Design a protein around this ligand. Structure first.
Ligand code: FY7
Ligand code: FY7
Lengths: 162, 164
């Protein structure tokens, strides 16, 4: 985990974070961080390899207002898994479908809350044949991820703010 | 699913018992969970849970050890754990803090900073009984991934119990 601190620049930090996630078994990740008292997700510090077109679509369609993981992050420090049960509203169903169209169907979002009031998320997606399989993979690496997200927050906020 | 009993708990007594049991199973026989609401700086009226000896908690406050305890300034700046380690260029007060902590049975341990979703500031401090630093670090490192999960479950349920 200590390799995140020693990185030079955003590209290398991103490369390290992506490979950590990739080696762990998650093909796609997004790391997003906002300063205290901001809700302008559009203009967050963002790192990762989500498809560019999806990132653009998410911003355009105002999905930050709809995405169930966003509101979850404002209320909690606990992970939220991308299960059918989290897409409760008709608009969130639309969100699920569009995210699925980008290849992002299985995964989880770890809320980030920094020492300086930074608000963020580390979202990770896993390629799987089905839900049950994806859930077992995620369970099998969850403690490692749980440490990872805080190491990423601490180093990530360092990169973005100091 | 073991972590779920922290939310199911009704009242501080019940919650404290569950948290202590979970921590004790992991080899931490003494714990203190401390939490302050958003923008509050006064460590006295903090929501404090655990089984640190009462006399030690009283003395820590009385002697003003919070300004000498390295974990305090660490917690305001980081979300990463800090292992208890004296500075070894230390002031009489810093020496006394560790000496009196040690006398209270709290020589080895770590503090997990707590930063809640609603701006809560706190710490989960846990002590392990050990003969030396090598043994202690072994004991703590071996449960660190589980503890990492526990501190966030404790933070989330504790904040609700305390403020919500
Ligand atoms: N900064 C910050 C931030 C702070 C709090 C919560 C969240 C975020 C965040 O990054 O949110 C985004 C953004 Br800004 C763009 C995208 Br694109 C995706 C997410 C978060 N959501 C997901 O990654 C997600 C969650 C569930 C299903 C599918 C996705 N997804 O594919 O985007
Ligand atoms: N709330 C909050 C809080 C918020 C941020 C940081 C810290 C705390 C905290 O609880 O700090 C205390 C207090 Br209030 C009393 C006691 Br008693 C002990 C600690 C934290 N420190 C330790 O537990 C500790 C750390 C290093 C060596 C020895 C000890 N110790 O035995 O107390």
């Amino acid at each position: 985990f200590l390799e995140l601190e020693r990185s030079s620049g955003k590209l290398e930090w991103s490369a390290i974070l992506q490979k950590m996630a990739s080696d762990l078994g998650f093909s796609k990740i997004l790391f997003g961080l906002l300063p205290k008292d901001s809700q302008d997700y559009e203009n967050a510090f963002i790192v990762g390899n989500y498809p560019a077109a999806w990132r653009e679509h998410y911003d355009r369609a105002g999905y930050a207002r709809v995405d169930p993981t966003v509101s979850h992050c404002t209320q909690s420090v606990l992970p939220i898994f991308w299960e059918p049960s989290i897409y409760q509203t008709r608009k969130q169903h639309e969100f699920f479908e569009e995210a699925s169209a980008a290849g992002l169907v299985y995964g989880l979002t770890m809320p980030l809350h920094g020492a300086r009031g930074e608000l963020g998320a580390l979202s990770l997606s896993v390629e799987a044949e089905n839900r049950a399989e994806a859930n077992r993979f995620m369970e099998s690496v969850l403690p490692t991820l749980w440490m990872l997200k805080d190491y990423a927050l601490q180093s990530g906020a360092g990169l973005a703010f100091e």
